[PDB]
Structure 1
Amino acid sequence: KEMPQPKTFGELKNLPLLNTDKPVQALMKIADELGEIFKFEAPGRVTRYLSSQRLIKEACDESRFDKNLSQALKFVRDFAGDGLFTSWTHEKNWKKAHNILLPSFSQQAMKGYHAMMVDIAVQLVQKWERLNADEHIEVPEDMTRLTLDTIGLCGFNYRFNSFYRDQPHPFITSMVRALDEAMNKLQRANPDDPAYDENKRQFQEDIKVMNDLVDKIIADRKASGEQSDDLLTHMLNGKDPETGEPLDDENIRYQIITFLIHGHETTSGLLSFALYFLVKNPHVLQKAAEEAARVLVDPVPSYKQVKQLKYVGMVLNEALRLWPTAPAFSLYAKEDTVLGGEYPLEKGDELMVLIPQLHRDKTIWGDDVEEFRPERFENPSAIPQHAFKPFGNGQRACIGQQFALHEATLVLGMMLKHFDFEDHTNYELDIKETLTLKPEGFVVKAKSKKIPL
């Protein structure tokens, strides 16, 4: 079987097709025309984009395929190092950090982080309670303040105090700029061009700003001896079951930077898309609000009450179905293998899972794939294996899944309890693509139900 492939441009191959600010959406369009698999070549590289549950379930076989570091991840590694997200599975530090961190990220472990999550969530709610009549909310902007501050506090007991500032903490400014630079290098035709000397200089400065803060906090903690309810305390005290070794200080720093750079943007996007879909679907919003009011009966949510927000959970899963905020992951063939009984692959061949397209597979989800219908997830164990993959696959899946969902469910629950929301501009969905996805420029008005915290 010959494999479909979009337009080529001479020696540049398919590369010009991704000369756009929205490449994932462009690839979804190509997938719409070419089907479940297409080859994509650039000067000196080749990948194949998968879109069907049929082929993705095979790609998800860990005996056959392992996580690949995409070019995007190789650039992010310049500041995320050998943290979990940017490591090869066979690097010693991957398995070691994975073993140590798994217990710190369990559903049970979320009880320990809940109070800090509530701290920041209350700050968001109070911010919105305190807006004057003529004001509005910049949704992704505020969700980003929320998620960064939450990961800072739960991550290493540090307050960025984002809700006290117009200009973010310097660490945050550097982080966002470093992420942007790693992204720009993907579409940069002539990297050695002197017009990029300043970018390179700035990138090194921003890496230093991030390293200096995190290294200082780690050093301060070891000198103080203080024990906290945070990830840092877990990483300082944890020992690998296999070797009995703890993580060294540099790797701990990379883990912290990783939780921030990856966790903040994905979770902020999710909350933003969820609110977007709620305001665009009033009947669904009514059902979510009814549950929030019924369940969240105390001045602040308890850990247990968050799990009881069953419909809110479904709303978030349905937002992740339509716009999974980390929209792709990359795999390599471990050995020569045949995919789908039709496509021969050689050892090391690279595959890309196009998640938003997977989540629109009509053979799994039915015809109404574009409809926002949380009720799809009423019985979540009834959805076929490998049909729904917003958190990636297997041992290389999101270690932060329970953290992200606890945070998102808590915060969306509180928003729904405390406010009526208005799509005051009839916002037109504009999805900005970076390492992640977000609804750019999404704004609302929130009218308080005047319920005290």
Structure 2
Amino acid sequence: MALYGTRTHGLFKRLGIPGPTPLPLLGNVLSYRQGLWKFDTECYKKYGKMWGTYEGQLPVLAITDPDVIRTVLVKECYSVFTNRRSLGPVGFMKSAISLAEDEEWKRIRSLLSPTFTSGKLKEMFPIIAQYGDVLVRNLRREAEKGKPVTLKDIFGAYSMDVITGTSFGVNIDSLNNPQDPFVESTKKFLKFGFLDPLFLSIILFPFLTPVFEALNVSLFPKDTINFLSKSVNRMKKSRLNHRLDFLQLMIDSQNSKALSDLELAAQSIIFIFAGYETTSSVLSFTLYELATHPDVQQKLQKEIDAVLPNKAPPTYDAVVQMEYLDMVVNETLRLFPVAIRLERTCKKDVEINGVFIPKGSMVVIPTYALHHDPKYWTEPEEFRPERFSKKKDSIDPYIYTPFGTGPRNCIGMRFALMNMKLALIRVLQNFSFKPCKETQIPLKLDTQGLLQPEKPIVLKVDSRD
């Protein structure tokens, strides 16, 4: 098959860009089975500054130079690298900001940015902090049994709870309501992005996307999409007969081009999708590191108690004072950047660092590989929150990209950091975490989708009182 399915496969050779030999039709996609985080790390070690791979026929150029990264993510964002990976079959979800393209993305990002400011976070803090209470008592009921706790169920419930309450102003108590159609629908998001036959065919043959769209085939759970879209239209219609949440802000902006009713539903769903799995995973990763580093956990516990004595309820200003908590979260996101990488598409032919890249090619910023580079991080595999202390050198924002950077960065980063810090404060005020004989040590990572532990994180949870 040396001449069937190898049409673009000589591009990087003619450019002088190194990279592993692709296979006909598949390209290098078989190398994804070990995990994208592992593939990016090994390619970085082997080839250095730049390497090229093929997703089927699609050329993929990875770059690690901070200056080139700044060029792709900031300087030429609106001019060359405005979109990400080519859109798959998603139906009306194509207007969600995470999947919008070109001028449609610019308008929707513009309309939504007032919702995600630090000012808006301050006003919404009390709504968010209320869900720390549900998290603590959920954790208490499971800790009271003396039996080790599976964190993914607790923090998965909190993650779904807090993002749903911030979105629609309703507490769903996910852990204790598994028959709720909303809870059952949203859990189906956990199976997204796996390298199943349909997903693999879309990456290999992106020209099949209009076929699957015409067949009403989607990468999202269609039933979940239809329920949430119907639930959104039910909630706005009920409000037509002083609410502070994501939905109300979008409704008000709609009554102030404007957001379409379909576009509003896409954003509402995508906010739940974005905050659900990622926030839960980082929270579970943080506690593994705290349990396996009790000195860090006790030092963090000391800072919480010094800022909020007598189990004081957290305030926005109290969180800003917790320097070590910021260091712990930052270092957890260095070790486990759950999105693994950043991706952009060349909207036109472009010269990247003196290399010609054809229109349509993908550029990858390997966040995970850059996060584990010993060139930038002393003992890169060690959990050391001390890297992010003000007594060290400034962190390069193009090397450390857990939320991306530039105009296309994570719009919900502030809210995500807040959601995680609040949860960490509450549980650490009440509980201490230590490993048991069931704790996978050292931790091993999965090989598909978002960064996730290969086996669920299980820990012994002891009340401080």
Moved over 4 A (4+): 188-191, 200-205
Task: Give, as a single letter, the amino acid of the residue that structure 2 aligns with 1:406.
Answer: M
Task: Identify if the C-alpha distance between structure 1 residues 353 and 326 changes in structure 2 by more than 3 Å, giving closer, same or farther.
Answer: same
Shift of residue 381 of structure 1?
8.7
| 1:194 alignment partner in structure 2 | none
Distance between the aligned counterparts of 2:217 and 2:190, measured in 1? 12
Distance between the aligned counterparts of 2:80 and 2:293, measured in 1? 39
Deviations 1:406-440 (A, max 9, x none): 11111111122211111113423122354421224
Matched, 1:443 2:436: no
| 2:43 alignment partner in structure 1 | 30
CA contact 2:92–2:262 (8 Å) conserved in 1: no
Distance between the aligned counterparts of 2:429 and 2:335, measured in 1? 25
Shift of residue 348 of structure 1?
3.4
The alignment yields a C-alpha RMSD, in angstroms, of 2.9
Task: Give, as a single letter, the amino acid of the residue that structure 2 aligns with 1:309.
Answer: M
Task: Give, as a single letter, the amino acid of the residue that structure 1 aligns with 2:18.
Answer: P
Task: Identify if the C-alpha distance between structure 1 residues 237 and 435 changes in structure 2 by more than 3 Å, giving closer, same or farther.
Answer: farther
Which secondary structure state, in structure 1, belongs to the residue aligned with residue 407 of structure 2? helix
Q: Which of the numbers 422, 430, 436 marks the counterpart of 2:444?
A: 430
| 2:180 alignment partner in structure 1 | 169
Q: Mind listing any 5+ residue stretches in structure 1 that lack a counterpart?
A: 192-196
Deviations 1:78-114 (A, max 9, x none): 47331111111322xx223222221211112112322
Shift of residue 203 of structure 1?
6.2
Q: Which of the numbers 66, 73, 81 marks the counterpart of 2:81?
A: 66
Task: Give, as a single letter, the amino acid of the residue that structure 1 aligns with 2:115.
Answer: S
Distance between the aligned counterparts of 1:21 and 1:173, measured in 2? 30
Matched, 1:332 2:369: no
Distance between the aligned counterparts of 1:79 and 1:238, measured in 2? 20
Task: Identify if the C-alpha distance between structure 1 residues 15 and 281 changes in structure 2 by more than 3 Å, giving closer, same or farther.
Answer: same
Matched, 1:150 2:162: yes
CA contact 1:211–1:253 (8 Å) conserved in 2: no
CA contact 2:327–2:388 (8 Å) conserved in 1: yes
User: Is 136-145 or 311-320 further displaced after alignment?
Assistant: 136-145
For residues 34-433 of structure 1, the aligned pairs below 5 Å read 34-63=47-76, 65-70=80-85, 74-75=88-89, 77-78=90-91, 80-91=93-104, 94-131=105-142, 132-165=144-177, 167=178, 169-177=180-188, 180=191, 182-183=193-194, 184=196, 185-187=198-200, 206-225=221-240, 227-238=242-253, 245-297=257-309, 298-341=311-354, 343-363=355-375, 365-379=376-390, 382-425=394-437, 426-428=439-441, 429-433=443-447
| 2:12 alignment partner in structure 1 | none
Report the TM-score, using the length of structure 1 for normalisation. Answer: 0.86
Shift of residue 7 of structure 1?
3.4
Distance between the aligned counterparts of 1:204 and 1:420, measured in 2? 40
Which secondary structure state, in structure 2, belongs to the residue aligned with residue 445 of structure 1? strand
Distance between the aligned counterparts of 1:332 and 1:213, measured in 2? 30
Distance between the aligned counterparts of 1:85 and 1:449, measured in 2? 41
Shift of residue 161 of structure 1?
2.0
Distance between the aligned counterparts of 2:80 and 2:287, measured in 1? 36
Distance between the aligned counterparts of 1:292 and 1:313, measured in 2? 12
Q: Mind listing any 5+ residue stretches in structure 2 that lack a counterpart?
A: 1-14, 206-211
Task: Give, as a single letter, the amino acid of the residue that structure 2 aligns with 1:427.
Answer: Q
Distance between the aligned counterparts of 2:339 and 2:115, measured in 1? 22
Distance between the aligned counterparts of 1:443 and 1:39, measured in 2? 39
Task: Give, as a single letter, the amino acid of the residue that structure 1 aligns with 2:235.
Answer: D
Which secondary structure state, in structure 2, belongs to the residue aligned with residue 27 of structure 1? helix
Q: Percent identity?
A: 25
Shift of residue 318 of structure 1?
0.8
Task: Give, as a single letter, the amino acid of the residue that structure 1 aligns with 2:248.
Answer: T
Distance between the aligned counterparts of 1:65 and 1:354, measured in 2? 19
Shift of residue 215 of structure 1?
3.2
